[PDB]
Amino acid sequence: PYKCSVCSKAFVNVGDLSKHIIIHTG
Ligand SMILES: [Zn+2]
């Protein structure tokens, strides 16, 4: 599951999510 738990969100997209995690960790 490509969910982004830290911001209580969820994705099924591997690209969008992985791009999201890198900005999450800054
Ligand atoms: Zn997020």
CA of 23 to the centre of ligand 1 (A): 8
- d(C-alpha 13, C-alpha 22), whole Å: 14
CA of 25 to the centre of ligand 1 (A): 10
- d(C-alpha 20, C-alpha 26), whole Å: 10
Q: Which SS3 state, helix, strand or coil, does residue 4 take?
A: strand
Q: What are phi and psi of 17, to 5 degrees?
A: -70, -50
* Residue 16 CB partners (closer than 8 Å, separation 6+): 2
Closest CA to 25 of 12, 2, 6: 6
- d(C-alpha 11, C-alpha 6), whole Å: 13
Closest CA to 4 of 19, 23, 14, 17: 17
CA of 9 to the centre of ligand 1 (A): 6
Number of domains present in the structure of the chain: 1
Instruction: Say which DSSP state 8 is in.
Output: T
Contact 11, 4 (CB under 8 A): yes
Question: Domain range spanning residue 22?
Answer: 1-26
Residue with tokens 């099924």: 12
Q: What are phi and psi of 13, to 5 degrees?
A: -100, 125
